[PDB]
Scaffold this active site. Structure first.
Site, PDB file in Angstrom:
ATOM      1  N   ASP B  65       1.528  -5.501  -8.558  1.00  0.00           N
ATOM      2  CA  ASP B  65       1.133  -4.186  -8.368  1.00  0.00           C
ATOM      3  C   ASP B  65      -0.199  -4.245  -7.607  1.00  0.00           C
ATOM      4  O   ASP B  65      -1.189  -4.526  -8.179  1.00  0.00           O
ATOM      5  CB  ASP B  65       0.912  -3.559  -9.733  1.00  0.00           C
ATOM      6  CG  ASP B  65       0.425  -2.183  -9.629  1.00  0.00           C
ATOM      7  OD1 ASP B  65       0.339  -1.665  -8.497  1.00  0.00           O
ATOM      8  OD2 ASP B  65       0.066  -1.616 -10.673  1.00  0.00           O
ATOM      9  N   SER B 142       1.577   0.923  11.518  1.00  0.00           N
ATOM     10  CA  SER B 142       2.325   2.123  11.820  1.00  0.00           C
ATOM     11  C   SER B 142       1.883   2.723  13.108  1.00  0.00           C
ATOM     12  O   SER B 142       0.855   2.400  13.658  1.00  0.00           O
ATOM     13  CB  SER B 142       2.155   3.143  10.738  1.00  0.00           C
ATOM     14  OG  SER B 142       2.748   4.361  11.134  1.00  0.00           O
ATOM     15  N   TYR B 155      -2.072   9.827   5.240  1.00  0.00           N
ATOM     16  CA  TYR B 155      -1.261   8.667   5.584  1.00  0.00           C
ATOM     17  C   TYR B 155      -1.923   7.960   6.769  1.00  0.00           C
ATOM     18  O   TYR B 155      -2.221   6.759   6.700  1.00  0.00           O
ATOM     19  CB  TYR B 155       0.182   9.087   5.956  1.00  0.00           C
ATOM     20  CG  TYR B 155       1.019   7.921   6.456  1.00  0.00           C
ATOM     21  CD1 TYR B 155       1.447   6.950   5.589  1.00  0.00           C
ATOM     22  CD2 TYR B 155       1.370   7.789   7.801  1.00  0.00           C
ATOM     23  CE1 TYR B 155       2.187   5.873   6.041  1.00  0.00           C
ATOM     24  CE2 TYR B 155       2.115   6.695   8.256  1.00  0.00           C
ATOM     25  CZ  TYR B 155       2.551   5.777   7.358  1.00  0.00           C
ATOM     26  OH  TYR B 155       3.219   4.657   7.772  1.00  0.00           O
ATOM     27  N   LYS B 159      -3.706   4.322   7.329  1.00  0.00           N
ATOM     28  CA  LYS B 159      -3.230   3.348   8.369  1.00  0.00           C
ATOM     29  C   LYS B 159      -4.237   3.052   9.518  1.00  0.00           C
ATOM     30  O   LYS B 159      -4.357   1.897   9.971  1.00  0.00           O
ATOM     31  CB  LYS B 159      -1.860   3.766   8.946  1.00  0.00           C
ATOM     32  CG  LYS B 159      -0.668   3.607   7.982  1.00  0.00           C
ATOM     33  CD  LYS B 159      -0.184   2.179   7.932  1.00  0.00           C
ATOM     34  CE  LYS B 159       0.629   1.884   6.675  1.00  0.00           C
ATOM     35  NZ  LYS B 159       1.404   0.634   6.900  1.00  0.00           N
TER      36      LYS B 159
END
Ligand SMILES: C[C@]12CC[C@@H]3c4ccc(O)cc4CC[C@H]3[C@@H]1CCC2=O
Lengths: 276, 276
Positions: B65, B142, B155, B159
């Site tokens: 994790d 990404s 997000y 990134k």
């Protein structure tokens, strides 16, 4: 009334000098809420606006802990004109060191303060501006949000983030009439056993050279808060402002080397040459 | 002895497909430790394993994790070979919505997982790779790390941060013989009430407009993870590894027009047109 302005990190540095600059304006144009994490350390700041003949109540001081959004929220409720025209997201933390040296709490506090803090503010204030169809928002950027700096892995992580966040929003807030600009600063003015023990011989050496080289560039090229503070106005006053504003032109060359080659290869080699 | 690969987020998508591709390489070159947040989700992976016929022992799973650095050290400890030739920081989360609709824990969850997570990994595994003077780290990148995208604010922020974190380390890591590269992926294959109330009406329309175009573009654009995993391969093998690899040409000219306008406002319109 005046253009209302709320600003964060007004304790020391940039935020301090910009808070005074707008308050003292030859127009008396801007009512300023400066915000601080310790409300007590506003000593620094009230002199240099009493000092500047800041008119009947052009500077207010609120407490804002960007880590906490109740504190962000009290701060909005206690802005009694019930709009903000200009939001300045300036509070920020640095984190310098070899990555495996850095405390996990230190790593998360930099993210929480630099990135999430700024998300809280935009959460809290940004709807009102969209409701209205005007508002300006100014974020203390960094050339280290635009290109990666050895031993500033997280600080940089943290400023790349702001770019990401601000650029994504900007795209949405185009037709809304709300404006969003980053002010990208080079530097500005205001363990060795431990380091070695938490890294290796080779990294320790690189850290201290980086430091020399760093102290060096600081002395040839570190700007002062009030200059930086000028670029904020230049962007406040701008008719149709741009997503970015650079304070110096000094790193346009290194930047263009990164924008030249997306593989990143030219930039990595260059910047490593530059530094070591 | 085989190349030791350790990969996070193999529950699904890219990391599932990458772990099996490597485990079943005809060379039998790769020893893969495939990690997952929750061991109960490892079914698809094993279906996929014997399916491509990974030999016995080419693949083991571990619980890991990335939010918890003790889970990171327990895993590092289970590497029997006591070394990692290739690290793949792939675990990741998405977050899609109007910024002011997003909740505070969610926003933080993403940073903690995408950014800090990668830091913990790199903190726990770079030390040994620097001592040896060898090691490859691959990080799942990404399109949203390269350019901001409406309604992916956090997000893209998370990134952009990896770009930052990764580039800064790469500048330091070049004399050490440790290579760090970003695999830049476009889209890849495998309440409305609430949203109206936590934002304004015009945003609301813009969101379901985005979503429409976003489903639109996931049909004209989404790659096989097979294709993507082959890009990781190419990076791994590369004798001269560059900081970034792109799995597609598509978005490269948006990246170029982003890059030659430092002001940023060309990119901002360009992307608004593209989207709405
Ligand atoms: C890395 C650097 C030293 C440290 C600078 C630094 C450090 C902190 C900061 O908030 C901004 C900057 C500006 C760019 C950085 C320099 C470019 C050339 C150089 O040697």
């Amino acid at each position: 009334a005046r253009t209302v302005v709320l600003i964060t990190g007004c304790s020391s540095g940039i935020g301090l000098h910009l808070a005074v600059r707008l308050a003292s304006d030859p127009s008396q144009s801007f009512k300023v809420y400066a915000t601080l994490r310790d409300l007590k350390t506003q000593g620094r700041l009230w002199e240099a606006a009493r000092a500047l003949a800041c008119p009947p109540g052009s500077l207010e001081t609120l407490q804002l802990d960007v880590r906490d959004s109740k504190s962000v929220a009290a701060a909005r409720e206690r802005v009694t004109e019930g709009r903000v025209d200009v939001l300045v997201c300036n509070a920020g933390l640095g984190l310098l060191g070899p990555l495996e040296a850095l405390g996990e709490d230190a790593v998360a506090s930099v993210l929480d303060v630099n990135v999430v803090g700024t998300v809280r503010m935009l959460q809290a204030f940004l709807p009102d501006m969209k409701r209205r169809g005007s508002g300006r928002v100014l974020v203390t950027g960094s050339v280290g949000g635009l290109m990666g700096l050895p031993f500033n892995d997280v600080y940089c992580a943290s400023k790349f983030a702001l770019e990401g966040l601000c650029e994504s929003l900007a795209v949405l807030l185009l037709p809304f009439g709300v404006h969003l600009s980053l002010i990208e600063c080079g530097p500005v003015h205001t363990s060795p056993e431990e380091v070695l023990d938490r890294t290796d011989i080779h990294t320790f050496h690189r850290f201290y050279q980086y430091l020399a080289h760093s102290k060096q560039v600081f002395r040839e090229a570190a700007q002062n808060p009030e200059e930086v503070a000028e670029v904020f106005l230049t962007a406040l006053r701008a008719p149709k402002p741009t997503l970015r504003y650079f304070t110096t032109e000094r790193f346009l060359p290194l930047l263009r080397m990164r924008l030249d080659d997306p593989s990143g290869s030219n930039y990595v080699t260059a910047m490593h040459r530059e530094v070591f």
